[PDB]
Amino acid sequence: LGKTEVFLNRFALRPLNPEELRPWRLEVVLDPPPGREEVYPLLAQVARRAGGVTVRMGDGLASWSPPEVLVLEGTLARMGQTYAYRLYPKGRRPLDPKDPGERSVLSALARRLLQERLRRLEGVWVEGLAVYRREHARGPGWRVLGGAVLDLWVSDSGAFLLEVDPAYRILCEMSLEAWLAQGHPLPKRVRNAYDRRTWELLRLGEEDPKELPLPSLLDYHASKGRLQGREGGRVAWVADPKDPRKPIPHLTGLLVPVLTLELPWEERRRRTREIASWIGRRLGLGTPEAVRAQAYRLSIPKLMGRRAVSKPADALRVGFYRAQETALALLRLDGAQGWPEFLRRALLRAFGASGASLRLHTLHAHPSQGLAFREALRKAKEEGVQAVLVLTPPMAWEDRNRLKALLLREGLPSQILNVPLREEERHRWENALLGLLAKAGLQVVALSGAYPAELAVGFNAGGRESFRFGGAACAVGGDGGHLLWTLPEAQAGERIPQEVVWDLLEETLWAFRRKAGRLPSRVLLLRDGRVPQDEFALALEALAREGIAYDLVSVRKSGGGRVYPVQGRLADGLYVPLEDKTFLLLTVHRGTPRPLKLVHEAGDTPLEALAHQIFHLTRLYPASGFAFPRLPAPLHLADRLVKEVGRLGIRHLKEVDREKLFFV
DNA sequence: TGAGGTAGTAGGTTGT
RNA sequence: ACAACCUACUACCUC
Ligand SMILES: [Mg+2]
Ligand SMILES: [Mg+2]
């Protein structure tokens, strides 16, 4: 559809000068010849110690300052060791904004120059490359500030670029004893005053600090120098952030509270244009010209119930895109008896429209019966039950998870619906109903349209603490197809192992080969952030050998900055090319919208096309009912799948149908 | 546990 | 330590 012009929260500034396009170069020289694994955290530390504006350039420094006015000789204490540096001038070296390699450096210096010129300005705050200008609260002990977070790089032409985005700080000005005595509840986070390590403040200790055995609190922390200039308070039984179970005593005097809980797009645009003007001139960088880019309102998707719909909730009266014969059991954990009538009517209305038939069972049993309860589950499944609705008061995480896993071990997904529930809460129970139905394995909605790819799979990592899970969900059938998940696999990090990516992918290829009678002509591959170097290498090879076409795309929930209209309102579905191989996509519009940032990593489909499918896949998600997810359904699904599997383990899923969206 | 979202604390992996 | 992404909490708003 239409073109448009939009404002990016970037601003063009002055060209770099003849001296800036040619930094001085320096050769570092450390005493304890550097460790092989420490040279980066440390070389970056020397660039800072050098003074002036100077960054790391390979294994030396690039400086925008003549060596004569740098601290070329110093010492350095990192992780306990004391290294002694010495900087040697190695003349100067021109850099080419054209060459993105040398441009990497010019933007490194740019960030320094930015933060170093923010440092010398009175009446503000500089927590990193961010500035806090107009204070926001007088407060009573605690001060919350206004301001903005900034960034500053170079460009192809060789000009500075200044990204700007409004922000806030929540700072404390007292002690864990002083602030808590000032009349406020106990904090969740609490950082040491003599260090930067943090703890999960659990409780207070009804024990004497002096006579308390330390596997003595009074004697141990005082014999470190902490007792000076301060007065340790009472025992504060804290617990590690890594090991959440084991407590460790500590003094409420040596602790500071890490306070936390305690803008509109019209306004945000404003505040951004202001902060940019000021900074532009107090910086000697010129008048801030608001960069503009061409946008494109993408063609709205055709959501299909049985008849077309605007929201998945509508399928509840129009009928489902593909309903089958389905049995749903009810489990109540409160005292009550049967299905609330309005819930019965509602399901029946929706199932009538769709055609096929509905059986409504009841589970007369309670988890408290132990194995008996499972046996009741086994019979429900036996009578064709597919999912269960659980009416109950709010469960606690631990009991919630136990229940969910319990039912899944008998292949019953389940939807929880909290029980103080009045019929006029239509939004709640309709969403619960949608959840119930997707968990049962129905396709509640689909898309009408032709797309480049007939198979779209999303890959996420991680729902766990120590290790994580790599998983994939997919929409199969280009048609605007039907949805399914695959068994996740545990992994050490964020990187999904190459063999796993392929294997998960092949499960979706096979799902396709079972629905249509062929291989897909082309798959769209979504990844949930950075694509770790070469992660899809093996997978993409295989797709070739098999004759399947593909497109890979990093989809990033952050980094896309902001997008404002030159005039009018922001529409749903703005596609905004940028540096080739990357574009923003503004898929939804609380306050100010955060656009996805997408990087076409591999494959030869045009950006607009990828941007078309992705935006549309945004509306495929069946469990949201009255609002769409910012993310394509395949990645939203995978995100959920990876979280549920981390909440409650992989062991339970062996007998659950990949077509039943149990994690929604 | 109805589901979306922005936005403020914290901390983790990949990468040079 | 820095970038790039990711994640957890909580608060707030919405149909
Ligand atoms: Mg992720
Ligand atoms: Mg759900």
Residue A644: give its domain's CATH number. 3.30.420.10
* A535 nearest nucleotide via C1' and CA: B14
**Torsions phi, psi of A10, nearest 5?**
-115, 165
Report chain B positions within 7 A of protein CB atoms. Answer: 1-16
Residue with tokens 């509602």: A346
Report chain C positions within 7 A of protein CB atoms. Answer: 1-15
Distance A436 CA to ligand 2 centre (A): 8
Distance CA A646, CA A243 (A): 17
Tokens of A280: 């532009």
Tokens of A475: 């929409």
Distance CA A296, CA A279 (A): 31
Tokens of A266: 């019209």
CB A326 within 8 A of CB A356: yes
Tokens of A141: 């002990």
Amino acid at A572: D
Residue A590: strand pairing partners: none
Q: Residue A506, SS3?
A: helix
Same domain? A53 vs A158: no
* A436 nearest nucleotide via C1' and CA: B2
Q: In sequence order, what E strands does A452-539 have?
A: 455-461, 468-476, 482-485, 489-491, 522-527
Tokens of A219: 């004697």
Q: Which of A59, A107, A106, A116 is nearest to A85 (CA)?
A: A59
CB A447 within 8 A of CB A304: yes
Cβ atoms within 10 A of the Cβ of A594, count?
A: 19
CB A554 within 8 A of CB A533: no
Distance A286 CA to ligand 1 centre (A): 39
Same domain? A233 vs A103: no
Same domain? A457 vs A507: yes
* A43 nearest nucleotide via C1' and CA: C1
The CA-atom distances, in angstroms, between A233 and each of A138, A206, A236 are 28, 12, 9
CB A414 within 8 A of CB A637: no
Distance CA A628, CA A434 (A): 13
What interhelical angle do A371-382 and A397-408 show, nearest 10?
50
Q: Residue A610, SS3?
A: helix
Which 3-state string (H, E, C) describes A233-251?
A: CCECCEECCCCCCCEECCE
Same domain? A487 vs A425: no
CB A208 within 8 A of CB A216: no
Ligand number nearest CA of A639 is 1
User: Is residue A380 within a helix (H) or strand (E), and if so which, with residue range?
Assistant: helix A371-382
PDB resolution in Å: 2.8
Distance A664 CA to ligand 2 centre (A): 4
Same domain? A440 vs A576: no
Tokens of A60: 């030396």
Same domain? A338 vs A424: yes
| Protein residue closest via CA to C1' of C13 | A590
User: Is residue A576 within a helix (H) or strand (E), and if so which, with residue range?
Assistant: strand A574-577
Domains held by chain A: number: 5
Distance A284 CA to ligand 2 centre (A): 53
Distance CA A118, CA A9 (A): 19
Ligand number nearest CA of A529 is 1
Distance CA A425, CA A195 (A): 50
Distance CA A325, CA A175 (A): 63
Same domain? A408 vs A346: yes
Q: Which of A425, A341, A335, A444 is nearest to A387 (CA)?
A: A444
CB A582 within 8 A of CB A575: no
The CA-atom distances, in angstroms, between A520 and each of A450, A517, A599, A614, A624 are 14, 9, 23, 18, 28
CATH number for the domain harbouring residue A105: 3.30.530.60
Tokens of A631: 């993310």
Q: Which of A476, A469, A431, A434 is nearest to A617 (CA)?
A: A476
Ligand number nearest CA of A642 is 1
Residue with tokens 């239409």: A2
Question: Would you say the C-beta of A466 is within 7 Å of strand C?
Answer: no
Cβ contacts of A144 within 8 Å, gap of 6 or more: A136, A137, A168, A169, A170, A171
CA A126 to C1' B13 (Å) is 27
Same domain? A413 vs A557: no
Question: Would you say the C-beta of A597 is within 7 Å of strand C?
Answer: yes
Q: Which of residues 1-30 of A touch strand B (CB under 7 A)?
A: none
Question: Would you say the C-beta of A494 is within 7 Å of strand C?
Answer: yes
Q: Which of A41, A76, A93 is the last residue of a domain?
A: A93
- The radius of gyration computed from the CA coordinates of chain A, to the nearest angstrom, equals 29
Distance A319 CA to ligand 2 centre (A): 21
Same domain? A194 vs A157: no
CB A663 within 8 A of CB A641: yes
Tokens of A568: 């009018």
Number of helices followed by number of strands (H, E) in chain A: 14, 34
Q: Residue A145, SS3?
A: strand
Q: Which of A541, A566, A591 is the last residue of a domain?
A: A566
Same domain? A462 vs A437: no
Q: Which of A566, A595, A619 is the last residue of a domain?
A: A566
CATH number for the domain harbouring residue A199: 2.170.260.50
Tokens of A309: 């719909």
The CA-atom distances, in angstroms, between A186 and each of A123, A177, A262, A302, A458 are 31, 10, 10, 51, 41
Question: Would you say the C-beta of A392 is within 7 Å of strand B?
Answer: yes
CATH number for the domain harbouring residue A379: 3.40.50.2300
For residue A540, what are the domain limits? Answer: 298-301+449-561+567-664
Distance CA A454, CA A508 (A): 11
Same domain? A634 vs A491: yes
User: Is residue A257 within a helix (H) or strand (E), and if so which, with residue range?
Assistant: strand A255-257
The CA-atom distances, in angstroms, between A413 and each of A108, A240, A319 are 51, 35, 22
CA A442 to C1' B8 (Å) is 39
CB A64 within 8 A of CB A53: yes
CB A204 within 8 A of CB A236: yes
Amino acid at A430: E
CA A471 to C1' B1 (Å) is 24
Same domain? A108 vs A48: no
Question: Would you say the C-beta of A535 is within 7 Å of strand C?
Answer: no
Question: Would you say the C-beta of A414 is within 7 Å of strand B?
Answer: yes
Q: What are the contacts of A184-189 at 24+ separation with CB within 8 A?
A: A184/A141, A184/A262, A187/A257, A187/A258, A187/A259, A188/A258, A188/A260, A188/A261, A189/A257, A189/A258, A189/A260
